[PDB]
């Protein structure tokens, strides 16, 4: 990424946003390498409105390598470009007179895994008696709609020759009108169950062993992501130990059972996504045609 990305231009006319129109609020997310802060921005989309945005910036004590890392990330977001189902770039603050700030879309409801897990007592397959009374309930239509949407996002990312490498519900963000968007260690005193997840549980067999990521290894990940959705945000492979024999059994053909809320065709889609042979897994385009039909047949 480095060196290469320094040789990509930055068009300030179309991306640069003045820092004096950005008012920062509370942090949304921390990391060992940086932070996303919630902020108010005036006129970020040219209209005369104050809009809530998310700001990636460096932590206090961040190095030169971490500045390069954020600037690469900015140029990759410029490269990737706009889609409804990715966390889109809105602007950047790069000139002298303040900190480096990369401004992206705010998704107010947070990640899809925590959201879904918080709706297990507000779920019905189809809305039976008067549909007014099941207001705010999740339904099969929602879950298949979240699915289709992520498949669109990934089809788009594939067409920009991008690879996600960590496709999971934690990295899916939910904004208003049920629109979902793809994005890419806290002190143990304040850690609760569910705070974390083991990323090996989303890795294709060829990535576990051969450590190669390709768009078809993302299709396997999409499969596990489907399972998260239709279990309403459970962790994959419940109570299973992720050791050398688990990895052995994966390659042999062992697979997760159906989660509690799946349709039979949605479980069949997980299994096709989990084909041992990468080239026999469906493409994200094929997943888009297929989930769109499932979504339409749910009627």
Please give the residue ranges that form the binding site for ligand 4TT (CB under 6 A).
28-29, 36, 54, 87, 104-108, 110, 173
Pairing assessment for the beta strands 50-57 and 89-93 based on DSSP bridges: unpaired
Burial annotation 249-279 (CB, 10 A radius, 16+ → b, else e): ebeeeeebebbebbbeebbebbebbbbeebe
Q: Which helix (H) or strand (E) holds 206?
A: helix 205-210
Cβ closer to ligand 4TT: 104 or 219? 104
Cβ closer to ligand 4TT: 36 or 287? 36
* CA 176/CA 249 separation, integer angstroms: 41
- Kindly state the smallest distance separating residue 77's Cβ from ligand 4TT, in Å: 12
Residue 127, classed as helix, strand or coil, is coil
- Kindly state the smallest distance separating residue 17's Cβ from ligand 4TT, in Å: 16
Does the annotation mark 166 as catalytic?
Answer: yes
- Residue 109 makes CB contacts below 8 A (sequence gap 6+) with 115, 173, 174, 175, 176
- Kindly state the smallest distance separating residue 2's Cβ from ligand 4TT, in Å: 23
Contact 57, 153 (CB under 8 A): no
Instruction: Check whether 53 is labelled as a binding-site residue.
Output: no
Taking CB atoms, the residue at the shortest distance from ligand 4TT is 110
- Kindly state the smallest distance separating residue 34's Cβ from ligand 4TT, in Å: 11
Instruction: Check whether 296 is labelled as a binding-site residue.
Output: no
The structure tokens 């998704």 sit at: 107
Cβ closer to ligand 4TT: 199 or 253? 199
Active-site residue among 166, 187, 218, 260? Answer: 166
Instruction: Check whether 56 is labelled as a binding-site residue.
Output: yes
Number of Cβ atoms within 10 Å of the Cβ of 173: 23
Instruction: Check whether 100 is labelled as a binding-site residue.
Output: no
Instruction: Check whether 81 is labelled as a binding-site residue.
Output: no
Q: Which residues line the annotated binding site?
A: 28-36, 56
Q: Which residues line the annotated binding site for ATP?
A: 28-36, 56
Residues with catalytic annotation? 166
């Amino acid at each position: 990424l480095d060196e290469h990305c320094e040789r990509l231009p930055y068009d300030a006319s179309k991306w640069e946003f003045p820092r004096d129109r950005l008012k920062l609020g509370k942090p949304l997310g921390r990391g060992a390498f940086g932070q996303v802060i919630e902020a108010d921005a005036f006129g970020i989309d040219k209209t005369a409105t104050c809009r809530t945005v998310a700001v990636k910036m460096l932590k206090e004590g961040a190095t030169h390598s971490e500045h390069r890392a954020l600037m690469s990330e900015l140029k990759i977001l410029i490269h990737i470009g706009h889609h409804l189902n990715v966390v889109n770039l809105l602007g950047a603050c790069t000139k002298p007179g303040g900190p480096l700030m990369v401004i992206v879309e705010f998704c107010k409801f947070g990640n899809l895994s925590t959201y879904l897990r918080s709706k297990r007592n507000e779920f019905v397959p189809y809305k039976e008696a008067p549909e007014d009374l099941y207001k705010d309930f999740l339904t099969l239509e929602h879950l298949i709609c979240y699915s289709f949407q992520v498949a669109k996002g990934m089809e788009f990312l594939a067409s920009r020759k991008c690879i996600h490498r960590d496709l999971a519900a934690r990295n899916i963000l939910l904004s208003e009108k049920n629109v979902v968007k793809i994005c890419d260690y806290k002190d143990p005193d304040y850690v609760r169950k569910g705070d974390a997840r083991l990323p090996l549980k989303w890795m294709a067999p060829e990535t576990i062993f051969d450590r190669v990521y390709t768009i078809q290894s993302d299709v396997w990940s999409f499969g596990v992501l489907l399972w998260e959705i239709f279990s309403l945000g459970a962790s994959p492979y419940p109570g299973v130990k992720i050791d050398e024999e688990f990895c052995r059994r994966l390659k042999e053909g062992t697979r997760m059972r159906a989660p509690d809320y799946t349709t039979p065709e949605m479980y069949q889609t997980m299994l096709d996504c989990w084909h041992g042979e990468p080239s026999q897994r469906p493409t994200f385009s094929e997943l888009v045609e297929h989930l769109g039909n499932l979504l339409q047949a749910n009627a």
